[PDB]
C-alpha cells in the first residue's frame, strides 16, 4: 500500500531485518502479499498483503 518506509526505526535488537525478510519472501511467494513490520508500541506484526498490479 505504501512502498516508502519498512522498519526505519532501528530499534529493535536488529533481528527485525531478518524477521521480515523471511516474512516478506514467504508472504511474496503467493505474488499476492508482501509482509511488512506492523510495529507501535512494541508489538511487531507481520502484515502479508499484495495482489494487484
Known sequence: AVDFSSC???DVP???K???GL???SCKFQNCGT???EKRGGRP???CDRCGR
Open 8 to 10: 526505519a526505526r532501528m
Open 14 to 16: 536488529g533481528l527485525s
Open 18 to 20: 531478518v524477521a521480515q
Open 23 to 25: 516474512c516478506i519472501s
Open 35 to 37: 509482509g511488512h513490520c
Open 45 to 47: 506484526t507481520c502484515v
